[PDB]
Amino acid sequence: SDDFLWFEGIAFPTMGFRSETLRKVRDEFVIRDEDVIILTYPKSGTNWLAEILCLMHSKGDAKWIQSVPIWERSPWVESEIGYTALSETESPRLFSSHLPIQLFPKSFFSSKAKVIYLMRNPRDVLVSGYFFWKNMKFIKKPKSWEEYFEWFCQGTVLYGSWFDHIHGWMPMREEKNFLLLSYEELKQDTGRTIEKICQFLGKTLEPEELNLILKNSSFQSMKENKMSNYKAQLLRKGVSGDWKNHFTVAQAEDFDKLFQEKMADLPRELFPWE
Amino acid sequence: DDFLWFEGIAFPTMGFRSETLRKVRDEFVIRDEDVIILTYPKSGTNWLAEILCLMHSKGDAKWIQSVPIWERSPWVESEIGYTALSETESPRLFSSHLPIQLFPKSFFSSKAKVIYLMRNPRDVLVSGYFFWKNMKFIKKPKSWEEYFEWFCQGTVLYGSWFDHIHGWMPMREEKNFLLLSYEELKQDTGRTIEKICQFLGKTLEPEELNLILKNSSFQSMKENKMSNYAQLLRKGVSGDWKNHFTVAQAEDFDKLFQEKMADLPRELFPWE
Ligand SMILES: Nc1ncnc2c1ncn2[C@@H]1O[C@H](COP(=O)(O)OS(=O)(=O)O)[C@@H](OP(=O)(O)O)[C@H]1O
Ligand SMILES: Nc1ncnc2c1ncn2[C@@H]1O[C@H](COP(=O)(O)OS(=O)(=O)O)[C@@H](OP(=O)(O)O)[C@H]1O
Ligand SMILES: [K+]
Ligand SMILES: [K+]
């Protein structure tokens, strides 16, 4: 399909990305031991976690996050813009990727860089991407909700199948330098999740800094910040369980059975959702 | 709104008059030889009408193919059907969507036969939404989710499905009342036609039964302009609600149904 850039069997937008750069990310891009990296399948909460990590760095202070765009603060490494920015950024770098593991820099796997993998209920991911992308250029636009649902289930969407992305990355979950989080836990107890992030990154927070990190990374505050919430909004609703307002009963039924079949080989305990 | 309201019930603004609806209820004379189809709208009225027309003609299709269905089985409460039925020789065949409290009072001391056809209200909902979607002389919903809310509230043509059923179900043990479902008509068409024959005192040969099943199938009725008035014949299955109810709508509707219908035997409803 020539509405996507196809690279190693995975779909990317037709503007912003270059197959030469994607090859270099895999083969050449040097990961430093001080790097902190956010990994997500698209629409799983990348920007929320980028905001939290920025607010950790600035101790809850908001001037920086309110005056520099979030995509400059946490560049998207496989994108042309992210790639070149990062090779000129001083440690410690913060950045993110949506790459499935077979495309991720080789350099990472023998380094000590810390990655946080954020997963989200793929039914909520499907809804989120549907609304964000549905009128965007340089992707294949679906004729309908039903068609986009079909693509998503078949993995013919940006960054390929959700099921493969997750299978690719789950074998890393017991590594010391890999934190596995979900959007559901992050939404349900933000404080306790930010504390998991602290232990992992070895940071300590004062009580007042914590209050401020919680305040400024909540949905309501981020939504107002135009540097972070980049005519369909990145911050659309910010809940778990919205898939219910959008899946038909038949789509729900089809998806439950595709999920149980694809994920049968992984501990059910990994996925905190119904 | 854009409805004619009568006794708290919405009707279209074209083709209907308050004064007629008064006479239908208070004055219209039901005859012992009338055969009457009662449905809440979008429950399969035209399917049943075509079947009974076909029984009348022993399966021959020429009549049903040359006279509009709504002329062979008039809608009694419309202007046109009211007037036409006053000039129709017995035995009359006709349809009504009226809830019990608007139905001709002379019916209840008559020996007319009614066939009440019920359908899963979720399927009724879908069916009306698509049919009445773009159409003047009634109020159009701005969205699927709004139409859904209307239907749940009863703010739709002919009022609440839950009340219609509640009003008419206490008649069901009467000798002259046949209760059917769209579901059994779809799943078990021969058996259902046999029950209608039994109820109306008709008998039917196998060649006749086959003609009836051929000439009243969805496909065959779809291609026949006298039966297909957006289209009357849209998809013609059961369970299409699953392709339109979101999961949350399904949860709301289940709760609503169970609450509204708890006073009737669950056995009445061959779905869910
Ligand atoms: N602060 C906060 N709280 C709760 N939820 C939030 C927050 N920030 C972003 N989000 C939600 O995450 C969804 C966007 O995901 P991504 O940032 O991964 O999108 S992207 O792939 O990076 O373009 C998108 O989800 P939906 O609301 O379900 O569409 C965002 O609203
Ligand atoms: N022959 C046949 N086989 C199967 N299904 C059929 C048939 N004829 C009508 N129908 C379906 O009944 C729906 C229309 O209902 P009504 O005739 O009650 O409409 S109306 O109230 O009289 O305007 C409408 O249902 P949906 O397809 O679900 O919209 C019709 O398609
Ligand atoms: K770990
Ligand atoms: K009876």
Method used to solve the structure: X-ray
Residues β-bridged to residue A158: A11
Pocket-forming residues, ligand 2, beta carbon under 6 Å:
B 39, 41-47, 123, 127, 216-218, 221, 232-236, 240
User: What is the C-alpha radius of gyration for chain A, rounded to an integer number of angstroms?
Assistant: 18
Length of chain A: 274
- The candidate with the shortest Cα–Cα distance to B75, out of B89, B95, B93, is B95
CATH number, span A1-274: 3.40.50.300
Q: Determine the residue of chain A that is closest to B122 in CA distance.
A: A249
- Rounded Cα–Cα distance for residues B172 and B174 (Å): 6
Q: What is the DSSP letter of A29?
A: P
Between the CA of A46 and the centroid of ligand 1 the distance, in Å, is 7
What 3-state DSSP class applies to B163? helix
- Rounded Cα–Cα distance for residues A219 and A228 (Å): 11
- Domain spans in chain B, listed from the N-terminal domain onward: 1-272
With contact defined as beta carbons under 8 Å apart, do A61 and A203 qualify?
A: no
Residues β-bridged to residue B224: none
A98 is catalytic: yes
- Rounded Cα–Cα distance for residues A234 and A12 (Å): 18
Distance in Å from the first CA to the final CA of chain A: 34
Q: Where are the alpha helices (DSSP H) in B143-246?
A: 144-153, 161-168, 182-187, 189-200, 206-215, 218-222
Which ligand does the CA of A158 lie closest to? 1
Instruction: Name the region of A131 (left: φ>0; alpha: ψ -120 to 50; beta: rest).
Output: alpha
DSSP string, B235-254: ---S-GGGGTSBHHHHHHHH
- The candidate with the shortest Cα–Cα distance to B227, out of B95, B54, B69, B81, is B69
CATH number, span B1-272: 3.40.50.300
Tokens (6 digits) for A36: 């902190």
Residues β-bridged to residue B93: B35
- Rounded Cα–Cα distance for residues B43 and B181 (Å): 8
With contact defined as beta carbons under 8 Å apart, do B102 and B21 qualify?
A: yes
Bridge-based pairing of strands A94-97 and A36-40 is parallel
Burial class (CB in 10 A: 0-12, 13-18, 19+), A157: buried
Q: Please report the resolution in angstroms.
A: 2.3
Q: What is the DSSP letter of B33?
A: T
With contact defined as beta carbons under 8 Å apart, do B59 and B1 qualify?
A: no
Tokens (6 digits) for A215: 């305040």
Cα four-point dihedral sign B216, B221, B225, B227: positive
- Rounded Cα–Cα distance for residues B241 and B253 (Å): 11
Distance of residue A148 Cα from the nearest chain B Cα, in angstroms: 15
Q: What is the DSSP letter of B10?
A: E
Q: Consult the annotation and say whether B127 binds a ligand.
A: yes
Instruction: Name the region of A35 (left: φ>0; alpha: ψ -120 to 50; beta: rest).
Output: beta
| One-letter amino acid of A171 | P
B43 Cα nearest atom in ligand 2: 18
What 3-state DSSP class applies to A219? helix
With contact defined as beta carbons under 8 Å apart, do A229 and A132 qualify?
A: no
- Rounded Cα–Cα distance for residues A98 and A43 (Å): 10
